[PDB]
Design a protein around this ligand. Structure first.
Ligand SMILES: O=S(=O)(O)N[C@@H]1[C@@H](O)[C@H](O)[C@@H](COS(=O)(=O)O)O[C@@H]1O
Length: 205
C-alpha cells in the first residue's frame, strides 16, 4: 500500500549522495540532498510493484515533505529512460514559476502541465499531497485550497507494462539543472487511500 522511495533506494551510506538530518516527522528520517546523481535508482523489481499498483488504481497518491531553496527548480521524482534519451515522467517543484510541473512523455511527445499557485520553494518545510487519477491532478499544500490541473494523457499511459525494463525511478534528480536543492522527507506513493483521508490524519479540516 505504501512505497517510500528513500527506503527503496537503499541505505544512505557515506557518499550516497544524501545526508541524514531532521524533518517535521521526528520518528522518520530526513535527507539533505548533496549530490542527487549518486543516489541509487529504485531497484527494478521494487519499481515493478509501483507500476502494477499505478496501473490498477489508474493513478496514485504522492506524499512529500520538502524544504526547498528559494527560486530554484527542484525535481522531486523522475522516471528516466535507461538508454539516457530522457525522462518519461517527472514532478518538478518549480520555484521560479511558483508551480508544480508534471511532465509526461508518451510516444516520443513530451507533455508538460503546471499546477498553478503552488509555491513550495521557501527555505522552510512544506507538505504536499498529489492525487493523480486518469488525466486529473489535484494538489494540496499542507491544509490549503486544493489546486487542480488536467493532463493531456491519462497517467497510466506513461506506466506501460514493460516500463521497469526501459526506465528507472530516480529521486531528487531530473533535468540537467533541476536536481533538488534542499531537504526531503517521506516521499511516498500511497495506494488504496484518498487525499481526503490523508488530510484528516495530518490534522487538517
Ligand atoms: O535553541 S533552542 O531553541 O534552545 N533548542 C531547541 C529545543 O529547545 C527544541 O525543543 C527543539 C525542537 O523544537 S520544535 O519546536 O521543533 O519542537 O529544537 C531546538 O533543539
Amino acid at each position: 500500500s505504501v512505497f517510500d522511495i528513500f527506503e527503496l533506494t537503499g541505505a544512505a551510506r557515506k557518499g550516497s549522495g544524501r545526508r541524514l538530518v531532521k524533518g517535521p516527522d521526528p520518528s522518520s528520517p530526513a535527507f539533505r540532498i548533496e549530490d542527487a546523481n549518486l543516489i541509487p535508482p529504485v531497484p527494478d523489481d521494487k519499481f515493478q510493484d509501483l507500476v502494477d499498483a499505478v496501473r490498477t488504481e489508474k493513478g496514485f497518491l504522492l506524499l512529500a515533505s520538502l524544504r526547498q531553496m528559494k527560486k530554484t527548480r527542484g525535481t522531486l521524482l523522475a522516471l528516466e529512460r535507461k538508454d539516457h534519451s530522457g525522462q518519461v515522467f517527472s514532478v518538478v517543484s518549480n520555484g521560479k514559476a511558483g508551480t508544480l510541473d508534471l511532465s509526461l512523455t508518451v510516444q516520443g511527445k513530451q507533455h508538460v502541465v503546471s499546477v498553478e499557485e503552488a509555491l513550495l520553494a521557501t527555505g522552510q518545510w512544506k507538505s504536499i499531497t498529489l492525487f493523480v487519477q486518469e488525466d486529473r491532478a489535484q494538489l494540496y499544500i499542507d491544509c490549503e485550497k486544493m489546486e487542480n490541473a488536467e493532463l493531456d494523457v491519462p497517467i497510466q499511459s506513461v506506466f506501460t507494462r514493460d516500463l521497469a525494463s526501459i526506465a528507472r525511478l530516480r529521486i531528487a534528480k531530473g533535468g540537467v539543472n533541476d536536481n533538488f536543492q534542499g531537504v526531503l522527507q517521506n516521499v511516498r506513493f500511497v495506494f488504496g487511500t484518498t487525499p481526503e483521508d490523508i488530510l484528516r490524519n495530518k490534522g487538517c479540516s
